[PDB]
Design a protein around this ligand. Structure first.
Ligand SMILES: [Zn+2]
Ligand SMILES: [Zn+2]
Ligand SMILES: [Zn+2]
Ligand SMILES: [Zn+2]
Lengths: 73, 72
DNA sequence: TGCAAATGTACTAGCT
DNA sequence: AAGCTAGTACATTTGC
């Protein structure tokens, strides 16, 4: 029914940077590329990213964005 | 020379029965008072150090309880 | 309390 | 019109 972001499963708003994603992942990805962050995972570089757990691990969120194909060109 | 028994930061005193940093003092008070329906994105054994304690409320609250924090 | 960083929404710019 | 996304400003969250 409702389009699903391929990063967090929140409702997708469009195809952003090459990948159907939600509003919060679009801006999260651009800020992650062009910004400095000490994103450090606390598990095994392998976390679950869903609508809640996405805030838990930005390191694994960024990782799953890239594995989904996001790119700024 | 005083380490937090939850995250290992500069403990600021004995809070809710446990030597703990300021940040863990406040986090446990918030967690214990309201819902703590937190969720872990890993395997319920996330590393909870000064850097990564922000990452997993669920594992942090679990560690608070393991260390003995309570409202005595 | 304050200050600030991170995150998320809603909106505008600009294209076709 | 219609439909799209990238950007941006604002608000909210979260944390010292
Ligand atoms: Zn998303
Ligand atoms: Zn992770
Ligand atoms: Zn602590
Ligand atoms: Zn965890």
């Amino acid at each position: 029914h409702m389009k699903l972001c391929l990063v967090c499963s929140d409702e997708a708003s469009g195809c952003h940077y090459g990948v159907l994603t939600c509003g919060s992942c679009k801006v999260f990805f651009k800020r992650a590329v062009e910004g400095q962050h000490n994103y450090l995972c606390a598990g095994r570089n392998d976390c679950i990213i869903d609508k809640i757990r996405r805030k838990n691990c930005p390191a694994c969120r960024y990782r799953k964005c890239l594995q989904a194909g996001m790119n700024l060109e």
